[PDB]
Structure formats: C-alpha cells, structure tokens
Design a protein around this nucleic acid. Structure first.
Ligand SMILES: [Mg+2]
Ligand SMILES: [Mg+2]
Ligand SMILES: [Mg+2]
Ligand SMILES: [Mg+2]
Ligand SMILES: [Mg+2]
Ligand SMILES: [Mg+2]
Ligand SMILES: [Mg+2]
Ligand SMILES: [Mg+2]
Ligand SMILES: [Mg+2]
Ligand SMILES: [Mg+2]
Ligand SMILES: [Zn+2]
Lengths: 125, 127, 80, 60, 206, 24, 155, 98
RNA sequence: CCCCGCCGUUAGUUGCCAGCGGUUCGGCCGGGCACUCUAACGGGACUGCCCGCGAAAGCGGGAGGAAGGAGGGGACGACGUCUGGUCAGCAUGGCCCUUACGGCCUGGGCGACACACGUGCUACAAUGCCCACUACAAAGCGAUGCCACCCGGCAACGGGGAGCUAAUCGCAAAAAGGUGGGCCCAGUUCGGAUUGGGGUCUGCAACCCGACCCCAUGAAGCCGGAAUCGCUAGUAAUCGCGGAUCAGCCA
C-alpha cells in the first residue's frame, strides 16, 4: 500500500499489484521484486513493513512514475506540436501517427463514427 | 527367434517385434506409458492381444517413426495384429472380423486452389 | 522508435553547401530536394526551402528540431 | 512493356537496389519466376510447347 | 474459354520436349534464353524450308540442333553453302560450337505445324477460308491419318464481325492421352488484323 | 493471444524470437 | 440426402465402459477435435458421480439420458397460408442425439468453474428428473401438446 | 570407391544409362554395389491460368530431378578403360568424386 | 496419366535393444539389409466367387481380401452461351501524338480520410491465459546462401566460426499434446489496439512510407440487428510447418 505515490494496490500477488502503478508493468514488477528481494508470490496484505519500504525506496526512487510520467508524456507531445513536426500535425488532428492507413480502420484514434450521407443520384446504397 | 509385422496409419509406421513371455512393452527405447503418457486412447493399441487372450503371454519391442502419436497408436495395433498372425495363421478368423488386419487408407486430403483448405470454400457476398 | 545504427545519414551535397555557408553569412533560402537528409546542429539559424513535390517551403531551422528530418516539416498532402 | 523501359539492360544501374527482373521474353515486369527468367504467362506458354526440359504438368 | 494445350497435356507420354537437356538452377535460366534465340533465328531465316519442330539437345557444354523441315533443300543450299552460314550464325551467339542437322519431314500433310502454316499462308493470299480448311482436312485425311481438325478464328473474309470456321473428320479424341495428336498453330497477319489457325492431327492410338 | 508481441504464443505467430521466446 | 437413406455411422465403443452411448457423449463434449481432454473431462466427471453417490456412473449416466429423450416435438411446416408448428413423433435415433446435445449444452450453462463438475452435476440432476436439460424437454413436449390442433399435418 | 552421382530430368534415361555404367560384369569383373535409388527433388510452379484477374484459376507445373549413385570398389584402371566414347544419354549430367 | 491405400522383384555411406561384437552407451564403431524407408518395375479388383430379386443391364446382401462395385484425391471442361474479361503481359487492323500522348532525372503520389461495403486476422477467456519441463510430422528451401557451435547483449542482433553443391550439414522450434506450477471469474495474469521512449537490421536513402526488439502505455471488445457464408469424413473445426515473389517488407 502506497508503493508509488497514491498507488495502493492490495490483496493480489505483489507482482500483479505493482502493475496497478503507472510507469510499472509485468517487467518492472518482476525486476523491482528481484532487486529488492521480495518473493513475487506473497499477497500484498502479507508484507513486512520493512519490505514495503525497500519497495517504495526503490520503485519511487528509481523511475519516472505516475503523474510525473503523465506530465512528461503530455509535454513530450506538445513538444512536437509546437514545432511544425509531421507527427505533431497528426496529433493535432487526432489521426494515427505511426504511418497507419486512414481510409478505413482508424477508429481507435478517430473515435466513434461520424456518419454522413451516401449518394445523390446512383445505385441502391 | 521372434515374430514380426509392420503396420502403418496416416504417415506413421510401426515396427512390432513380439517375443514370448510376460507382457512388457517398450516403444522407442521407452516404457509404453513413458511414451504414450496419459493419452486416453493408448491402451487400444493392444486390443489384438486383449482379444486373442495374449495379455501376459507375449512381450513386445516396438519402434515407431512418423506422423503423430494417435496415428502411431493405430500403426502399432496393426503391427501387433500382423506379427500375431505370422505367429499363428489360425488366429485370423479370431482376429479378422474385428478388422484389426485392415490398414486405414484414410489420409489427409490435398489442398486445392481457390479453396481455403482442401474443401473449405471461401466466403462470398451479393447473391 | 527509428533507426540508422551508426552513420546518421545526411545528404552531403546539401552538407558541403551549408558548412560552406559558415565561412561567412547565412544565405536566405536554400533550395533542397533532399528532404531525405537528417538535421544536424550546424544547421540552426539558416532557412532551408525544402521541396514538397510541388513547392519549396521556408523551413526556419531552430534548435528544438536538431535531430529530425527535413521532410518532417514540408507537408506533402493538402487536406481540407 | 514500353521498349524504352528495357533500360533494365543497365548492367550499370547506378545504385544496386534499382535492379529489377522483367520477363526476358515479353518484358512483363510482374510475376517473373526467376528460375526461368520467364513471367507467369510466358512460363505457361513455353511449358505447353515442351520447350522447358523436364517440366511436366503437376498433379497429386 | 476452356480447352488445354494438347501437347502441353501429353508432354509426359506420346510427346516429348522440344529441347531436352538439363541444368542446375544457376544455368537453366540462360541455357533456355539462348535455346530460344536459336528457335527465333531459325524461324525467321528458315521460314520457306517449312520447319515443323526444332529439337535442341545439350550435353558436355555443346549444343545440337535438329531442324525438322519439309524440303531439306533450302537449308543445305549449294552442295552445303547455306547450312554453314547458319551453323556459323548460330555458333556466333552460342559461343559453344553448335551442331546443326536436318531431318526429312516426309509428309508435310501429317505434321500439324505445317498443315496450319499452310492454311494461314493461303489466308494472307486472300483464299476462301471455308474451302481452304475443308481441303486441308482432306489433304491430311488422305495422307494416312485416323482423324484431323482445323480451326480458323475470325475476321474470316475481312468480315467486320469475327467468326469461327471449323471442319474436321475422323476421330480427334482430345480428352484421351493414349492419343498422339500433333497440334500446330499458325498466325496469319492480314491487311485488316490477325487470324489464328490451329491444326489437329490424330494419328494412331497406343 | 497471438496478438501480444511479448508472449510465447505471440512470438511463434510472427515467426520471431526474443526475450519472451528465446532461440535456444 | 436426395438419393440414399444415409446410414448412421457406427462409432467405436467406450474404452472404460465399453459403451457406445459414452463415445457419442464424449464426442459432443469435444470441441476443435481435442478428443483427449474431452474424455479427460467425461471420465473426471464420472469419478465425481461416485464420490457423491454410491451408484456407479454408468447407470447414473444412462438414467440421465433417459429423462432427457423427448417423446414429441414440433417442427414448423410451410403451408398455403403461412407457418404451423406441427407436433411429430420423435424417431428413437433422434431422441439419442437430442438428449446428448441438450445435456452438454445445459452442462455448460451451469456456473461451476471446472468442466467435469458441470457435467457431473448436470448428469446427476438429469438422472434425478431436474436440472436444465430436463426442462428443454418437458419444455419441448409441451409445445407438441400445445399445438395438438395441428397434429394432422404430420409430414 | 569411385563415387558417381547421376541426375537428370528423365527417370527412364537415368536408370537405363546408369545400368550401362555397370560393365566389367554384374559382380564378376570388378564388384558393383547396385544403382542406388536416392530421392528426387521436385520444384513446383503454380500460375494463374489466364492473363488478367481470375485469381482462383491456376495450373500446377513441376520440374522433378532424379538422382542415382552406383559406387564401385576396386577402381582398377582396366575397367575404367571403358569410359571413353561409351555413352548415349543426352540430358543426363555426370558427377565424379573419390 | 498422376498421387494415396496392401504385396513382390530389384536397390543398400538413409534405416538396426531385428541378431552378434565393441561402447566415450551417441547407430557411436565393427558389422549386416532382414525391417522401416528411398524410387524404378510389377502383381492385385473382374460383380470373378456366394445366397436372394431380375428378361437383360443391374440391384440387395454374404465370403474371402489391404481394399468390393466409381476404394480415396488430382489432372482432364462437348456443340455452344454471356457482342463476358483482357489493346496494361504479349502479339494485332484502324485511329491519334511526333523539340511531345516519345525520353531522362530528382521530389511527391499510387499509403491521402467526414464516411460506406467486400475479404480476412486477433479477440471477448477456465474445454482458458501464463511459465517451466517433455514428446510425436509431412512437405519444402539453401553457396551474392542455410548458417551448427562459441562470445557480447534482457533482446532484435553484432563479432567469431565448423559442416553442407546437401536421404549425409543447416533453416528446425513443430504447435496443439503430455507432466508440474501460477492465475480464480475480474475488463482480469482475458484482449493487445493506441501512444510515449530507447534501440537492432536491410538498404545511397526508412519524414511522407519498412519490418523486428526492449520499456512504459493497456483502447474497443462479456459472443454480435435485419441479413448472411462454408462444410457430408481425415470433411468441418482446430494446431503448427514450408515455399514461390523478395535487399528489406507492411504476409
Ligand atoms: Mg481469393
Ligand atoms: Mg509495346
Ligand atoms: Mg526490388
Ligand atoms: Mg495476454
Ligand atoms: Mg489470385
Ligand atoms: Mg474423362
Ligand atoms: Mg470492360
Ligand atoms: Mg493500391
Ligand atoms: Mg469475463
Ligand atoms: Mg458433397
Ligand atoms: Zn513474359
């Protein structure tokens, strides 16, 4: 509990729990458990306060986590928005950025479908 | 010294050498179950013996090469049935009506073009 | 996530051009068709007119952009 | 194709990664089975005239 | 739209390959290319010889053409003063010492490429197609032969709407392999577009 | 799933090797 | 079947109860040709029918099937007016197939996590006259009797 | 131990012509180890039948290559004194190691 | 004609507790081809035999047989139809352009996105996901190559470096499967879209517009309206493997 800022993950295995933190995933979980010596398997509620500190002292003092990340990412994007950059423009319009197609199939970045009219004088559609 | 039959099944070939004795079977330098470990079907490769009362009257040394384990299980069921018949040609009328002597012609069917999958026809629209 | 392992490719006919514009002054507008060319620190300040397929475009090179690529600032297509 | 585009003949084609195949028989730049240098049509036409040795009709 | 090539359909049995050598994958490609410039030189120069097929065999580096023709005269020339200009025009491009031959095609009326070549010839000289065909079937059906067929395409008569004129007698069993059915195709460039001439000749079974 | 690049299953599909599917 | 009568394929017998009803049932459990774990399911479910009921599973199983086989069913018939649920007999070959299916489908609506559990508990409930399968059966014969007025278009 | 791998495109003109390369005797003039079958290698071409669209048409071409072995023990030069002009297969190709 | 199913003759640098000897216990070595196999050539099925119906052709069933009436799969598409398709593969009549409707570059485009459909992939999980261990394929491809095995590296991959013109070396791991362990019903240890970051490789060159690796991110999706597609048996369904094209790749 309170392993990263505000992050209280509880009651699951400690390796799963840590992933409930922002800049922390299957990897860094595995890692920070090795480098601080806590068994992956133990439930979070079954943790020595002395262990929860070696965790916090590591995770918190060794990577950019939580809002401290979300902050950088946000300014990392405005960065290429301020300059003329092409990826910046794509971000500005809210279209794919990694050279994907946009004729079909861009829904996840585009959002839900903004349907318009079909024909004026043509076949059945 | 021993008794032999071949026996094949769907790209898998069994070599069955029968010797007299106890009942102990060894496929590919391994105990029977060491190989076919926990496959509900395995016991069925020995139905030739289980139906000539040869349970514990024969030992068997087998090598099997090809395909996958369930096909090998059938190839053995022939090899055993075939060796058992050059051991005793009177065993046929016992064994033939159970079919153990009929090699299973059923083989994987070829992939055709403009199909997905030898028969699986690709799906179409507007009709 | 991009590449060029060791060599950091920069089109050199432009490079000999820009380095030679630093014996003295910084010529306004440089006409390149090598959008293909990585930006380097020794380009800050000048103005490079990158093509387009259709027109050279006045790309004021700052220092925020010292690593990117010239074609990253000459947008090709015209949309709404 | 265009006769001018059998400038594939450029044994010196500047950069190497501009090399391309082209059917030696009808110029066809696409589907050009390289064992034969023939394209997919020329391949079938010659195969039916028996002019590619050892090349039978396949079936199985 | 249907119907294979009767030769391409029998190439394993009751017909063999127009060039029958061998090569690994580094060579096949070029040997074929040369192999074909041979046939291309041999079909422009040797037109009037009336050649049916052009067999090629290669072996220890060498080559071995066997030009089958109707009138082996015009390939020999004056005692031999023609068959050496060609055997030299060949070993020019083929830097590999060629070995020209000539095989007497007796019976120009039983080799399909000839039969067809002939009908296409008449068509350029503005002959009557219907008759041209019916005759060639006869000319072939007489000269031995268990059956035969001839197809001209369309623009028959310089006609504005392409047609297809037919004609065949005896047996011509295309779907049976035990057949032995020479097939020949002649083109026929005319003043008004092209015409295709196919000749089928069934001769004996097994 | 065969879509997670960093699984065993997911590597096999894309015919690759890596941390999440060592070569040998 | 526009020509011949299409013969029933004879399945091989069970390896543990020598019964071909069992192989019929292990087949309908099996998906994607995974036959191994289909047995591995059924058999595991069999050693749950004893460990909760002294009777050996083979009677409990065939008892359960019997409660699910239907005696009457409707099948819609096109008429010169519209559609008509028509009550029909049920061939004994089709009672076989209907009960085995409904068993395995009702088994997998059950909320028990392990699959053998679901089959076991469904096999028991059926043999006991209840559980989901026996509904969609008493439920079928209902409609056959509810549309008795039309039982005179019997194909 | 004269190893002579023989291959070509026509199996009639191999086995025939590898039968011809056994001529100090069947096994009464050298030794001979029987011509070895040795599997064939089948290259396959599949081609869209017509010239345009019709994706699902297709026609299959193979180019099989068959290989034989032979192998003679006692490479005496008397018997070798037959490999002069003693041949007749064209589209067969010969390889020799020892 | 081809392939698959049973059997033989020929054939032994692939195959063997066959049977022996030697064991670094590896078919490794001596040794043998019997077996499996490899690939050439034969045999074998004909309603021939049996009972029943039939005027016959045949139909039903029964023996024996590996296989029984078309044993299983391919190749094979009649006279003709659609004034079908294709002048952009190739030919080809006519028509037109002829310091440009021809040619060469460099850059862009064919990848544009408010939308709509076709075909697919991956899913929505416990008959499941994950990790470890362990086992059985067929067909292919390889010397401007396949790259065993070592070293750096979490890894892509770099360095080094054997064998292999390849039944002999390599791609090569098969994967579902099996044993053990984790997850416990959750938008989850389900799903892996999106985006941020750092990197390897191929290429003159990866902005537009490449694939792969690692870290973070972890979207929609809880089985799909009206409608609608495939398949009758080694078939569907499901699981992986290979090849053509190709530097690399959007497979
Ligand atoms: Mg398709
Ligand atoms: Mg042209
Ligand atoms: Mg290329
Ligand atoms: Mg996952
Ligand atoms: Mg296609
Ligand atoms: Mg036929
Ligand atoms: Mg059109
Ligand atoms: Mg396109
Ligand atoms: Mg759920
Ligand atoms: Mg059908
Ligand atoms: Zn071509």
């Amino acid at each position: 509990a309170r392993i990263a800022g505000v992050e209280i993950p509880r009651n699951k295995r400690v390796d799963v729990a840590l992933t409930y933190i922002y800049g922390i995933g299957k990897a860094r979980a595995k890692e920070a458990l090795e480098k601080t010596g806590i068994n992956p398997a133990t439930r979070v509620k079954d943790l020595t306060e002395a262990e929860v500190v070696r965790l916090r002292e590591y995770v918190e003092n060794t990577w950019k986590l939580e809002g401290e990340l979300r902050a950088e990412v946000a300014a990392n994007i405005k960065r290429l928005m301020d300059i003329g950059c092409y990826r910046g423009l794509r971000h500005r319009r809210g279209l794919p950025v990694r050279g994907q197609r946009t004729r079909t199939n861009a829904r996840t970045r585009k959002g839900p479908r903004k349907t318009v009219a079909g024909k004026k004088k043509a076949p059945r559609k | 010294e021993q008794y032999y039959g071949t026996g094949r099944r769907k790209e898998a070939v069994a070599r069955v050498f029968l010797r007299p004795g106890n009942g102990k079977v060894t496929v590919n330098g391994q105990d029977f179950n060491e190989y076919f470990q926990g496959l509900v079907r395995a016991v069925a490769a020995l139905e030739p013996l289980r139906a000539v009362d040869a349970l514990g009257h024969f030992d068997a040394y087998i090598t099997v090469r090809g395909g996958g384990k369930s096909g090998q299980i059938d190839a053995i069921k022939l090899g055993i049935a075939r060796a058992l018949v050059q051991y005793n040609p009177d065993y046929r009328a016992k064994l033939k009506p159970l079919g153990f002597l009929t090699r299973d012609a059923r083989v994987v069917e070829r992939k055709k073009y403009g199909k997905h999958k030898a028969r699986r026809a690709p799906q179409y629209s507007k009709r | 996530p991009r590449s060029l392992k060791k060599g950091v490719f920069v089109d050199d006919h432009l490079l000999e051009k820009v380095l030679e514009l630093n014996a003295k002054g910084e010529k306004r507008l440089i006409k390149t068709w090598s959008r293909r060319s990585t930006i380097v620190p020794e380009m800050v300040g000048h103005t490079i007119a990158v093509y387009n397929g259709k027109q050279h475009v006045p790309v004021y090179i700052t220092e925020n952009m010292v690593g990117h690529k010239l074609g990253e600032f000459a947008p090709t297509r015209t949309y709404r | 194709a265009r006769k001018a585009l059998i400038e594939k003949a450029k044994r010196t084609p500047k950069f190497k990664v501009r090399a391309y195949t082209r059917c030696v028989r009808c110029g066809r730049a696409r589907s050009v089975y390289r064992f034969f240098g023939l394209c997919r049509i020329c391949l079938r036409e010659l195969a039916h005239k028996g002019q590619l040795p050892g090349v039978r009709k396949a079936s199985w | 739209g249907n119907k294979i090539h009767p030769i391409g359909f029998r190439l394993g049995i009751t017909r063999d390959w127009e060039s029958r050598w061998y090569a690994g994958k580094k060579q096949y490609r070029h040997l074929l290319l040369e192999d074909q410039r041979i046939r291309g030189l041999l079909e422009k120069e040797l037109y009037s010889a009336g050649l049916a097929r052009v067999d090629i065999e290669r072996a220890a580096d060498n080559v071995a053409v066997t030009v089958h023709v109707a009138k082996p005269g015009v390939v020999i020339g004056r005692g031999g003063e023609r068959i050496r200009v060609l055997r030299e025009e060949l070993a020019k491009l083929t830097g590999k010492n060629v070995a020209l031959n000539v095989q007497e095609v007796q019976n120009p009326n039983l080799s399909a490429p000839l039969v067809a070549q002939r009908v296409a010839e008449q068509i350029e000289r503005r002959f009557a197609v219907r008759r041209a065909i019916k005759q060639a079937v006869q000319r072939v059906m007489e000269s031995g032969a268990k059956g035969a067929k001839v197809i001209v395409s369309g623009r028959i008569g310089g006609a504005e709407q392409a047609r297809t004129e037919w004609a065949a007698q005896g047996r011509v069993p295309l779907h049976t392999l035990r057949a032995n059915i020479d097939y020949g195709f002649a083109l026929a460039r005319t003043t008004y577009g092209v015409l295709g001439v196919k000749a089928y000749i069934f001769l004996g079974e097994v | 799933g065969k879509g997670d690049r960093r699984t065993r299953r997911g590597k096999i599909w894309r015919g690759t090797y890596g941390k999440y599917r060592p070569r040998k | 079947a526009r020509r011949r009568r299409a013969e029933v394929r004879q399945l091989q017998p069970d390896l543990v109860y020598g019964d071909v009803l069992v192989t019929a049932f292990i087949n309908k459990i099996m998906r994607d040709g995974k036959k191994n774990l289909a047995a591995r399911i059924f058999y595991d479910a069999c050693k749950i029918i004893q460990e909760k009921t002294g009777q050996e599973p083979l009677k409990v199983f065939k008892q359960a099937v019997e409660n699910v086989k239907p005696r009457m069913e409707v099948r819609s018939r096109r008429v010169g007016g519209a559609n008509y649920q028509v009550p029909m007999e049920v061939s004994p070959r089709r009672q076989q197939s209907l009960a085995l299916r409904w068993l395995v489908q009702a088994a997998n609506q059950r909320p028990e996590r392990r699959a053998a559990v679901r089959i076991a508990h469904e096999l028991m409930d059926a043999a006991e006259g209840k559980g989901g399968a026996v509904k969609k059966k008493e439920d079928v014969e209902r409609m056959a009797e509810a549309n008795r007025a039309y039982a005179h278009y019997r194909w | 131990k004269i190893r002579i791998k023989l291959r070509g495109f026509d199996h009639k003109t191999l086995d025939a012509s590898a039968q011809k390369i056994v001529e100090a005797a069947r096994r009464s003039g050298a030794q001979v180890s029987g011509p070895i079958p040795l599997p064939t290698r089948v290259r396959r071409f599949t081609v869209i039948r017509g010239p345009f669209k019709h994706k699902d048409s297709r026609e299959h071409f193979e180019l099989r290559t068959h290989n034989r072995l032979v192998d003679i023990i006692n490479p005496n030069r008397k018997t070798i004194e037959q490999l002069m002009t003693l041949d007749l297969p064209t589209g067969v190709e010969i390889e020799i190691k020892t």
